[PDB]
Amino acid sequence: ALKPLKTWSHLAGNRRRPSEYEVVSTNLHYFTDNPERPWELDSNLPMQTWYKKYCFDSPLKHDDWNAFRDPDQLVYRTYNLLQDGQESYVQGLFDQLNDRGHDQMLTREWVETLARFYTPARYLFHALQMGSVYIHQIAPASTITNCATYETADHLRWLTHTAYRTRELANCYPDVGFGKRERDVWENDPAWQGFRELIEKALIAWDWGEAFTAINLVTKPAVEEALLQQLGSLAQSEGDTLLGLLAQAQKRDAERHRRWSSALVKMALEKEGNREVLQKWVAKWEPLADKAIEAYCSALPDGENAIVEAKSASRYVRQMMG
Amino acid sequence: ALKPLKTWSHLAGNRRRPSEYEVVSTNLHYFTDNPERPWELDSNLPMQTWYKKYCFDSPLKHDDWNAFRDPDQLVYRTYNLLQDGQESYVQGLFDQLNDRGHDQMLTREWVETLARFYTPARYLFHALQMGSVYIHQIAPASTITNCATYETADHLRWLTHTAYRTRELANCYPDVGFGKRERDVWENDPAWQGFRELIEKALIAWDWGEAFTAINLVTKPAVEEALLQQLGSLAQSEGDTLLGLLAQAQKRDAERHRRWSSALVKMALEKEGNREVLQKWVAKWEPLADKAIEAYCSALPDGENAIVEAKSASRYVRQMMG
Amino acid sequence: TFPIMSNFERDFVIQLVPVDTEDTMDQVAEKCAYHSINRRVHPQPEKILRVRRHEDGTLFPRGMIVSDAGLRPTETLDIIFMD
Amino acid sequence: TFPIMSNFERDFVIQLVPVDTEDTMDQVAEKCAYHSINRRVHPQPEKILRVRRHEDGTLFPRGMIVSDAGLRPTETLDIIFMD
Amino acid sequence: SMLKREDWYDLTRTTNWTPKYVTENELFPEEMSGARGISMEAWEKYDEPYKITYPEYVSIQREKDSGAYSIKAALERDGFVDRADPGWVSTMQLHFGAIALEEYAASTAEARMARFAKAPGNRNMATFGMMDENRHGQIQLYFPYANVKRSRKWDWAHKAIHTNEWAAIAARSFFDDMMMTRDSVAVSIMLTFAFETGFVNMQFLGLAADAAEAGDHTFASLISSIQTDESRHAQQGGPSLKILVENGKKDEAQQMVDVAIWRSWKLFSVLTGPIMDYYTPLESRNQSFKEFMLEWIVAQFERQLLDLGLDKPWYWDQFMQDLDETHHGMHLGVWYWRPTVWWDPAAGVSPEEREWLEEKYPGWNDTWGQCWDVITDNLVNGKPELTVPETLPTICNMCNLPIAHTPGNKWNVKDYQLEYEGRLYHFGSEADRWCFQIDPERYENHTNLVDRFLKGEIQPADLAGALMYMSLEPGVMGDDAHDYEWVKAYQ
Amino acid sequence: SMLKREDWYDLTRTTNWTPKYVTENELFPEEMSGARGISMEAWEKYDEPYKITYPEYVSIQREKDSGAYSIKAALERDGFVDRADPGWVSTMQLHFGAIALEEYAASTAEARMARFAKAPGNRNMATFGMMDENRHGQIQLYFPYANVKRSRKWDWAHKAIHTNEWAAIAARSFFDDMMMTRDSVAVSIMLTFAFETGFVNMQFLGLAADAAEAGDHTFASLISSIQTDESRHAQQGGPSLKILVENGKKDEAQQMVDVAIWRSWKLFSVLTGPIMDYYTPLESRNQSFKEFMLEWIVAQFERQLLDLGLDKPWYWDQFMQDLDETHHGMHLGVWYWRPTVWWDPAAGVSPEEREWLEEKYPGWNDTWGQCWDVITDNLVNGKPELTVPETLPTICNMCNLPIAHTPGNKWNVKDYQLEYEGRLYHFGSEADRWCFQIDPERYENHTNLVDRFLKGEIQPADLAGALMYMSLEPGVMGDDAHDYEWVKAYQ
Ligand SMILES: [Fe+3]
Ligand SMILES: [Fe+3]
Ligand SMILES: [Fe+3]
Ligand SMILES: [Fe+3]
Structure with missing residues (x-):
């Protein structure tokens, strides 16, 4: 008779006792069990075809995607613990800067700058929300999917x-x-048309590997540097300390997204030919990112330098990945 | 045989079902059961004499001090919930303003102002800690004592x-x-000598009623207006946004202390002669408070106005109590 | 060898029962009884087991063989008690 | 009426027992036995109960009365089995 | 100060815009969105009844896990599992194996709506729903993980859905059809309205109560905590149905509901029915599966359908009749074929239990009771080999469950066969066959376990070969939960 | 970024300053501070081993209550209390009544140190300690509050210390002496070192285990959660003792420790000993009270005293001997006088229990067993009236507990009388009398229950009058926990 194991059968013989993260996040997707018929129905259904073309047939390849591990090792339990604290901080800022009459101290010029450069971001942030949640449903491993899950929650937070x-x-x-x-x-x-064109087009890049690249490697660094880094620095220098701090707080989520994205790229580079696959996609999407940054930042005061800095900082994210 | 009750026997027949606050905070002191021999030992021990002279013989009188109720209804459980959130906010400020290099942006003049007017407060805040914790151990009712308990914890927080x-x-x-x-x-x-003389003298006012007055009604409003309100406003205008926000955050605790202090004064005024007793004590300690504010605030930029504002604001606290 | 689905009388479940194209209906019933009689259904020694096509109720003679019954592979058959 | 503390032999606890200044030691022992014999200690019909001052062990004669024993109120007395 | 939620809530879902660099159909592919000709503006009328924002979510859910995980840790050394009724242990092993990974899969079903629903309120609620199922998949893996050293059966909490064991196939058949291969709007209707709102919400309420009654407070706290999350995302189908009905699609809406409710019922008849009427100890049975269904499931559906302007499904009456039969057959099937599941089925046919069954189901003993009579006699007479099968039962090509029904004195077992494009399909009910007929291309070439056996895909082509094909081996292969202790009452 | 705790910790306790507007003695009255001639600078060497800051405290303690309160709420409807062993219910009723308000009183004892200790590290740790006891008083009121509708006895969780019931007097006698009427330094030594570090820390560890063994996870989680707070403030006495020893006060330090340990032991002999050896069901007894004391209490004291440079108290050997006797007497006393307490004492003298007792305490049956023999015969022979008292026992003027000891074949009951200023005092031990003699003015005119009875302060001057004086009435007055069920074994 089969004897009881000390951990899950798919994790047995790991030498080191599985962490909570590994226990609740690994090898959970079952549609990858039968590549010829991912779902338990007729193999010609549209959804069968969708996963075969956009998940299984992606040029970004690996023999064991389930080996991927989130460097932050986020789990639902720890995600809520982490973010509840961060929200205590942000909601604390909202509450107390309001008590202080912070918004009444802003100049009319800046208020008008907020209406043009700040509040319309609700559309761009929701578009990222949609972008990361699509990655979730088409990624080849549950550990990759989870990083996209929490990232999606963060976009909703913004x-x-x-x-x-x-x-x-x-x-x-x-x-x-x-x-x-x-x-x-x-x-x-x-x-906003640079960013709008970029995200609208990126939103219909169905291949999981291209979605990851377009959204996490190209679009997000550009959005983050322009709307968080650049607008945030401007906000501070203009007397809007709330936005300066808010943008910085949201940047913490962005840094985490970059950490897992960097880890996935690292894993992908274990396979010959993947770097080239990723660079091809980056090369296709980068021009639209430049356009996005140029259109947005050039309209800001001291725009030309904002453009140079944002372009440099976003490219640096990918450079450090290889 | 005695039948089971629906609540504690001392709370039975309240019409409205006792709250968690009332269940865990009322009628807990037992030294008040035998005024002639508060403690279960020889009646002539120094501690017996101490409580008889400073608790029982206080001129601030009431027939049922156990009737007192904290308006905020703080309980240990809710105190930690409340403050853990506030600390998440404050520690968040510390963490993120540091990441931002906030202290490096301060001018040398202001840095020197901090060394003189800000950091030495660790002594004054600890003195308040000692002041409120003495009130705790000599107050005639457990509900009064608890307000002093949490207030003491807040002073330690500062x-x-x-x-x-x-x-x-x-x-x-x-x-x-x-x-x-x-x-x-x-x-x-x-x-600092004005405040130092005030708190050193107030610290040896053993009568519970006089301790309450000297510490909560006179000293604290003066300390709060000078060190939190005045220094905090100055800090903000001088570019130290951290201190401006920190002082404001600590002021939330001070507002809560004033709320329960105001409730106790209200209860005391139910008895003829107590207002006069309290006004007598205020009249004795107020001159030292003025001295404290004058010495500290006059040394600050735009000192004369800081003095006028602080004096006005602190007196207003007592005025609104009657 | 030919697969049929046995819906044995008084049983609660239809079962897969491999018969032979040369089996008579009597032999089919016997192969079907193996999976129901004395397992979930009591024998009825005074009755004779007959084979009926489940879909339309066509009763096959005891001596007819599978080969001549015009059954679709996996066809469901009622195995009933008669006389 | 005079209070004494009874330390009855073989019992486990000393008890408050009110006696009379006119009681003989025999009557004191009897009043003390009431709270120990047949409650926590078995009778010893072949023995005689004697009264001894607990502090120094002074044995009082059976016929001496409380009034002449020189006891301090609440004095502890051993009630022992003898002969 | 802070704003009141109601004063800014709408801005969180004022996220639709008119695409320019790509077309609307490109951005919202019909096969994934299911907008069905209804405009973006019309979909914007979508208004979820239960509202919640990000900061409220992370705060409330944080406390939820704090409590559940704290209770688990406090009761762990107690080892209640080691002394719990065998029928209860089986209930949990079945539970975890059947839904842990499907719960996790539901986060993808939610993600389908988060990205493809044209209703912005739907997109945000599905994001929270996505997080909810992430929680449910993880916590229902973490909890049973504590028992892995006790039995290999607990490994199936993770392994089951990765196998071709018949119960796992039936589960994926249901879930893949309802939530993994449907457009966004369809998912909101078939998953959140029909299944979650219609079955799971109340089921978990009863399950948590049963756990407490069995003395398992760790599991009771788990399920209990889980079900408080349900309505937050289960509410998503209602608004979609209103929009379909008020626009030109009442028939399309009705049909999805008809399909989803029936398929949900079949899964329920095998995973819940047997547990309530047979695994739960007699003295802990507050009501029968049928009573539970009438009081907590059926009336609620009728109320919901009436309020939406929809009709009772065409099969409603038959469905009512089946509450007296179906699960009894599913139970007998699972017990008779016990070596084919990963938990130990409890017979539940002792004299006292049979009395209860007769009371709850008049006629039980003269029908279902007769099969059990033969089984009992064989066990009493030392012929246990006649209580296990030597063949496979016929499987429904829709629900992938055995085709079974009333036996004994009121024999009424029927197969709703269908010849389609040169292949004979078998169905366990009129409604199951109908689900195939209204959309044959969705199920056409799928093969059930019997089909595979007959095709030569299971080798060796024998029972031992089939067990291996299903990843079953001694140690996890099921047997009678109480080790036939109930047989002693018959001697 | 954030600083490492160690880099700024010292600044939190760099709070001493040289007073100018008032004198040092005015600011730190010797009767409240107990600096004992040791300078402020010398006291500043005080260094608590376990460090913690405000933000860490509120975060860690928040999660503590979240868990404890969550477990209580999850297990409340279960009503375990209604089916728990009667001996266990009695254990809790005794527990809550005896310490809930004393726990709360300890926050004042902590406040004494927070305001009057010259050691700044002591002042801050006592502030956290003050908060800790606030928690303990509140949570041990909130938990039993759930049972008020079950029995008036639960009302004593709040009422007890407000009465003159003998057990309550004994408790206040101990607590008021150790922590409520002592200078700051004395409190840190007598309360935190001697009692909390010396007895409570391990006791609560065993109590939590016993609760789990009894099946009470609500109480187990409560006590368990409570004891993790202990060392945070229990650590306060150690540093004070080092300072007294390294300066000129080793003898003063030794004497406070000698007094505190003995008084703690007496309270322990009546509140814990009887529970371990008699109320806890035989099959749940992992070890005897004596074994518990030798393994978890005594050796630890010797280790601590040796490390501090102190000596074993002069009574140490006698104390060792008494582990075989004292609590057996306290138990028999409480049971015989059961109507005088607010819980139902469990006899614990069935044949099997008496076998265990003989094994754990050779000679028990020929000594303690004989009193129980007579009691048992009377119950068997229908003379229950001979198992309840008609007088008061002699009470120790120090510990306020009955003066009892070895009976039967090795009778060894002694009263350590003392005539002082025209009054005869009675003491239950050599050490109890010594505590009075080294500081007679501290106890001189206090009167125990017997003294009051004899003075005419209890009216009517009879047993019924005494019960009323102690606030006891039928409903809460104690009786045999198992309603004499154990008598059936003797017939
Ligand atoms: Fe779920
Ligand atoms: Fe759900
Ligand atoms: Fe405590
Ligand atoms: Fe403590």
């Missing part, structure tokens, strides 16, 4: 911060149009 | 914030003497 501050700003400056005008700015303002 | 920032400041400006020079400043700087 959307939420933005939605909250937008109402606060609207209450303080009823005449500006906060909450009402953002869709038109996102859809028609030249400063 | 000391702790100060100890932490002092090391951070010392690391950033090794030459200033942060951490090393505070005792001499507290003991010899004219700006």
Whole structure:
């Protein structure tokens, strides 16, 4: 008779006792068990075809994607512990800077800058939310999927911060149009068309490997450097300490996303030909990222330098991965 | 035979079902059961005499001090929940403003102002800690004692914030003497002698009612307006946003202390003659409070106005109590 | 060898039962009884087991063989008690 | 009425036992036995109960009365089995 | 100060925009979105009844795990599992193996809606729903993990859905059809409305109560904690149905509900019915599976359908009748074929239990009871070999469960066969065959275990070969839960 | 980034300053501080071994209550209390009544140190200690509160220390002497070192284990959670003793330790000893009270004293001998006088239990067993009235506990009387009398229950009057825990 094991059968003989992270996150996807018929139904259904073309047939290859491990080792339990603390900090800032009348101290010029460069981000942040959640449902391993799961939750977090501050700003400056005008700015303002074209196109890149690259390796670094780093620095220098701190707080989530993205690229580079596959995709999407940064940052004060810095910082993210 | 009750026997027949706060905080002191021999030993022991003179014989009287109820209804469980969130916010500020290099952006003048007006407060805050903890052990009811318990914990919290920032400041400006020079400043700087004399004298006011008044009604409002309100406003205007926010955060604890102090005064005023008793004590201690504020605030930039504001704000606390 | 699904009378489940194209209906019933009689159904010594096509209820003579029954592979058959 | 503390032989606890200043030691022992014999100690019909001052072990004659024993109120007395 | 949630909530779901660099159909592929000709503007009327924001979610869910994990740690050394009723241990082993990985798979079903629903409120609620199922998959792996050293059977909490054991196939058949291979709108209807709102919400409530009654507070706290998350994402189907009904699709909506409810019922008839009426000790049975269904499941569906402007499915009456039969057959099937599952099935046919069954189901003894009579006689008479099978039962090509029904004095077992494109399909019910017929291309070439056996895909082509094919070996292969202790009452 | 705790910790306790507007003696009254001629500088060498800061405290303690309260809520409907062994229910009722309010009183003892200790590290640790006892008083009120509708006895969790019931007097006698009426330094030594570090830390560890063994996970989680807080403030006495020893006070330090350990032992002999050897079911007894004392209490004291440069108390050997006797007397006393306590004492003298006792205490049956023999015969022979008292036992003027000791074949009951200033005092031991003699003015005019009875302070001056004086009435007055069920074994 089969004897009881000390851990899960797929983890037995690991030498080191499996962590909580490994116990609850590994080898969970079962659609990868039968590549010819991922789902337990007719093999010609649209969804069968979708996973075969966009997951299994991706040029980004590896013999054992389930070996991937999130460097931060996030689990649902620890994700909520981590973020509940960070939200205690952010909500604390909102609460106390409000008590202080922080928004009433902003200049009219800056308030108008917020309406143009800050609040419309609710659309871009939600687009990232959609981008990372698609990665979740098409990635070849549960450990890759989970990183995308929590990343998606973070994008929703940013959307939420933005939605909250937008109402606060609207209450303080009823005449500006906060909450009402953002869709038109996102859809028609030249400063946003670079990012809008980039994310709209990236959103229909169904191959899991290309989605990862377009969204996590190219789009996010550009969005983060422009909207968090650049706008955040400007905000601080302009007297908006709340946004300066908020952007910095959200940047912590972005750093974590880069850590797991970097780990996945590292794993991918174990296979000959993958670096070239990734560089091909980066080369295809990078031009749109430059356009996004140029259109947004050039419209900001001291725009040309903001453009140079953002381009340099975002490229550095990929450079450090190889 | 005695039938089981629906609540504690001392709370039975309250009409409204006792709250968690009432269940765990009421009628807990037993030394008040035998005023002639509070403790279960010889009635002439020094401690017996101490409680008879400073608790039972206090001119601030009431027939049922156990009826007192903390307006915030703090319990150990909810105290830690409340403060853990607030500390998540404060520690978040420390962590992220440091990442930002906040202390390196301060001017040399301000840094020197911190060494003189900010860091020596570790002594004053600890003195308040001692002041409120003495109130705890001599108050006539467990509900009064508990408010003093949590207040004492808050004073320790302020000391702790100060100890932490002092090391951070010392690391950033090794030459200033942060951490090393505070005792001499507290003991010899004219700006601090007003407060030092006030708290040293208040610390030996053993009557529970006078301790409450000297510490909670007179000393604390003066300390709070000078060190939190005035120094905090100055800090903000001088570019030290961390201290501006820290002081504001600690002020939340001070507001809570004022709420329960106000409730106790209200209860005391149910008895004829107590207002007069309290006003007598305030009249005795107020002059020292004025001296404290004058010596500290006059040494600050725009000192005369700081003095006027602090005096006005602290007096307003007592005025609103009657 | 030919697969059929046995829906034995008084049993609760239909079962896979491999028969032979040369089996008579009597021999089919016997092969089917093996999986139901004395397992989940009591014998009925005074009755004769007959084979009926489940879908339309066509009763096959005791002596007819599978080969001539016009059954679809895996066809469901009722095995009933008669007389 | 005079209070004494009874330390009855073979019992485990000393007890408060009110006696009378006119009681003889025999009557004291009887009043003390009430709280120990047949409660926590077995009778010893072949023995005689005697009263001894616990502190120094002074044995009081059976016929001496409390009034003449020189006892301090609440004095502890051993009630022992003898002969 | 802070704003009131209601004052800024709408801005969190004011996220739709008019694409320009790609077309709307490219951004929202119909096969993934299922917008069904209904415009983006019309979908924006979607309004989830239960609202929640990110900071509220992470705070509330943090405390949820703090409590559940704390209770687990406090009761771990107690080893309740080592002295729990064998029927209860089996209930949990079945539970974890059948749903742990399907719970995790549901996060992908939620992700399908998060990315492809045109209703922005749906997209955000599905993001929270995605997180919820992530929690459920993880916590229902962490909890049974504590028992791996006790029996290889606990390894199936992770392994089961990775095998071709018949129960696992039936589970994937259901889940893959309802939530993994459907467009966003379909998922919200078939998964959140029909299955989660319709079955799981109440089921977990009863399961948590049963766990407490069995003395298992670790499992009771687990299930209990899990079900408080349900309605947060289970609510997603309702709004979708209103939109389909108020626009041109009442029939399309009705059909998805009809399919989803029936398939949910079949899975329920085998995974829950047997447990309530046979594994749960007699003295702990507060009500029968049928009573549970009528009181907590059926009436609720009728109420929901009426409020949505939909009709009771065409099979409703038959469904009502089957509450007296189906699960009894599923139980007898699982017990008779016990070596084919990863838990120990409990017979539940002692004299006292049979009395209860007769009371709860008049006619049970003269029907179901007769099969059990023969089985009992053989055990009493030392012929245990006649209580295990030497062949495979016929399997439904839709639900992948054995085709069984009323035996004994009211024999009524039927096979709803269908010849389609040169292949004979077998179905366990009229409704199961109908699910195939309304969308044959969705199930056409799928093969059930019997089909594979007959095709030569299982080698060696014998029972031992089939067990290996299903990854079953002694140690995890099932047997009578109480080791036939109940036979002593018959001698 | 954040600093490492060690880099800034010292600044939190760099709080001493040289007073100018008041004198040092005014600011630190000797009767409250107990600096004993040792300078402020010398006291500043105080260095608590276990360090913690405010943010760490509120975070760690928050999670502590989250878990304990969550477990309580999850197990509440289960009503374990309604089916727990009667001896266990009695153990808890005794527990809550005897310490809930004393735990709360300890926050004042901690506050004494927070304000009056000249050692700044002591002042801060006592602030955390003050918070700890606040938690303990509150949580041990909240937990038993759940049982008030079950029996008036649970009301004593709050009421007991407010009465003159003899056990309550004995408790206040101990606590008021050790922590409520002593200078700061004395408190750190007598309370945190002698009692908390010396007895409570290990006791709660054993109690939590016993609760788990009895099947009470709510109480097990409670006690267990409580004891993890202990060492944080229990550590306060050690550093004080080092300072007294390295300066001119080794004898003063020794004497406080001698007194505190003995008084702690007496309270322990009546509140813990009887429970381990009589209330705990035979099959749950992992070890005897004596074995527990030798393994977990005595050796630890010897180790601690040796490391501090102190000596074993003069009574050490006698103390060792008493582990075979004292608690047996305390138990028999509590059971015989059962109507005088608020819980139901369990006799614990069945044939099997008496065998265990003989094994754990050779000679038990020929001594303690004989008293129990008479009691048992009377119960067997229908004379229950001879198993309850008609008088009061002699009470020790120090520990306020009955003066009892070895009976039967090795009768050795002694009263250590003392005539002082025209009054005769009675003591239960050589050490108890010594505690009075080294500081007579501290206990001189205190009166025990017997003294009050004899003074006319209890009216009516009879047993019924005494019960009323002690606030006892039918409903809470104790009786045999198992309702004399054990008598059936004797017929
Ligand atoms: Fe779920
Ligand atoms: Fe769900
Ligand atoms: Fe404690
Ligand atoms: Fe303690």
